[PDB]
Amino acid sequence: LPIPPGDFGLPWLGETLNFLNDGDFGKKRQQQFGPIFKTRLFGKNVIFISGALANRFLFTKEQETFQATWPLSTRILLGPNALATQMGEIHRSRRKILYQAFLPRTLDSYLPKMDGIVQGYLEQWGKANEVIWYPQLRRMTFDVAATLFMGEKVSQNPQLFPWFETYIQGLFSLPIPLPNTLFGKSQRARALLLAELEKIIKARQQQPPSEEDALGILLAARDDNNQPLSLPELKDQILLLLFAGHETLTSALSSFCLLLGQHSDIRERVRQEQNKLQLSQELTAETLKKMPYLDQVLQEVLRLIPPVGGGFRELIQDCQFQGFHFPKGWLVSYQISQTHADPDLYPDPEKFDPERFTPDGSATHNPPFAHVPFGGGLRECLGKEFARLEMKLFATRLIQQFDWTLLPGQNLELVVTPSPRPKDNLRVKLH
Numbered sequence: 439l440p441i442p443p444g445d446f447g448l449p450w451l452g453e454t455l456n457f458l459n460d461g462d463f464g465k466k467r468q469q470q471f472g473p474i475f476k477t478r479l480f481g482k483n484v485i486f487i488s489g490a491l492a493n494r495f496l497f498t499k500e501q502e503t504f505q506a507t508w509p510l511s512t513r514i515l516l517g518p519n520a521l522a523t524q525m526g527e528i529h530r531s532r533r534k535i536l537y538q539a540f541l542p543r544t545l546d547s548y549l550p551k552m553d554g555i556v557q558g559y560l561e562q563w564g565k566a567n568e569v570i571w572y573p574q575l576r577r578m579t580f581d582v583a584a585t586l587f588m589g590e591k592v593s594q595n596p597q598l599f600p601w602f603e604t605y606i607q608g609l610f611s612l613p614i615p616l617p618n619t620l621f622g623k624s625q626r627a628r629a630l631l632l633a634e635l636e637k638i639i640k641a642r643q644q645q646p647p648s649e650e651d652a653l654g655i656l657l658a659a660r661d662d663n664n665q666p667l668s669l670p671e672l673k674d675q676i677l678l679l680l681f682a683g684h685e686t687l688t689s690a691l692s693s694f695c696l697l698l699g700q701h702s703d704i705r706e707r708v709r710q711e712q713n714k715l716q717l718s719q720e721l722t723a724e725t726l727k728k729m730p731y732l733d734q735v736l737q738e739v740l741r742l743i744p745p746v747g748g749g750f751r752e753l754i755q756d757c758q759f760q761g762f763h764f765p766k767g768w769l770v771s772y773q774i775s776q777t778h779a780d781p782d783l784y785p786d787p788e789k790f791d792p793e794r795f796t797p798d799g800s801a802t803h804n805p806p807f808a809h810v811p812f813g814g815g816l817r818e819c820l821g822k823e824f825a826r827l828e829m830k831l832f833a834t835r836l837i838q839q840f841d842w843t844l845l846p847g848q849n850l851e852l853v854v855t856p857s858p859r860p861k862d863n864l865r866v867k868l869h
């Protein structure tokens with residue numbers, strides 16, 4: 439019956455400029471208007487919800503109620519043929535296709551190359567008397583990603599990271615189409631990446647077909663009419679995998695490096711765990727599955743510092759939640775970082791405690807959708823198990839060979855956009 443409280447502000451524009459400029463935008467309007475507040479963003483009316491009951495609603499009867507929604511600049515720079523921007527039955531089809539790159543045994547098989555790249559970066563970081571971490575994790579993740587998705591020779595194309603960086607920086611920028619803008623820069627970085635992605639694909643097309651990585655899996659894939667994915671699609675899809683893992687996983691690793699830096703007890707607890715095993719050079723996918731305490735740590739890392747703040751959906755049906763009215767063609771924004779800061783769901787919600795996830799912990803006795811670092815439902819992270827594998831293999835190889843000290847004085851407060859990151863971007867020494 440009734441619509442949520444809150445200011446629509448100006449016609450079309452709404453509170454768009456406040457959204458774009460104001461850090462505690464959602465906090466100010468949650469406090470005035472309570473837990474469910476309306477607003478207006480870029481010509482759409484928008485409801486902000488949060489916490490377990492709102493998540494269940496979003497991830498419930500999902501198909502007929504909610505569809506993905508992106509800003510104009512993002513639609514354009516991602517393109518019309520990416521998982522993120524595809525809809526209904528095409529999204530249903532492409533999600534099954536791409537999950538082939540992420541099966542538990544395709545994941546296992548990624549461990550060598552992945553291990554070599556983490557081992558590689560680990561030497562280089564040791565010999566430095568200081569390491570500025572955030573930008574260095576960025577390069578390492580991109581290297582794992584581009585190696586596992588397209589082959590080692592593709593990742594030693596040195597034009598790729600700089601272009602990709604410039605591509606990302608303008609994904610959520612204003613769509614102002616002059617060459618000297620974040621968006622015009624992204625546009626040109628996109629064209630450069632696409633022309634490179636083509637060469638890589640056409641060259642792989644010319645070889646004995648294999649389904650050992652993501653690019654081969656994509657080539658062998660068939661749509662619902664039994665047709666190969668077209669060439670623009672292959673390209674968008676690979677860019678999407680790159681975009682979707684980049685900031686997120688970099689943020690996750692930074693946060694772990696941060697939190698076990700400032701918590702040497704938990705790091706020794708994680709070290710103890712790996713000593714009770716047979717700590718040889720070799721590291722199996724199976725030995726990694728014998729690490730329940732590190733699993734807790736990574737659970738906790740992701741709840742305290744969630745890499746994806748939240749998300750948006752658009753109502754395709756008039757519907758209702760908590761008695762409030764949620765009208766067709768308005769938008770809904772859910773709030774991962776809010777859910778993860780809620781005091782009921784997490785007591786002392788600002789302390790780092792891996793015990794919350796022990797068999798009878800605080801977070802074990804919580805209702806569905808209380809821990810949502812990967813979202814949920816139809817759009818839940820397609821790369822969460824890949825993400826979990828790299829977080830874990832890294833955490834292991836780090837702790838195995840290194841203690842580490844942050845440096846005093848540095849501002850390690852977090853910038854929330856686009857992904858949480860210490861302001862001095864985490865400077866460090868390895869022991």
Ligand code: HEM
Nearest residue numbers: 522682683686687690746749811812813817819820821825
């Ligand atoms: C490291 C921690 C990561 C976190 C916390 C994370 C979080 C998320 C979340 C919350 C969503 C849902 C977006 C929404 O609600 O609208 C999402 C989507 C997605 N993620 Fe991740 N992500 C991570 C890493 C990765 C990686 C490494 C990959 C790929 C290798 C990946 C691939 C994807 C894809 C393809 C989607 C879109 C799925 C779809 O539209 O069907 N993520 N991620």
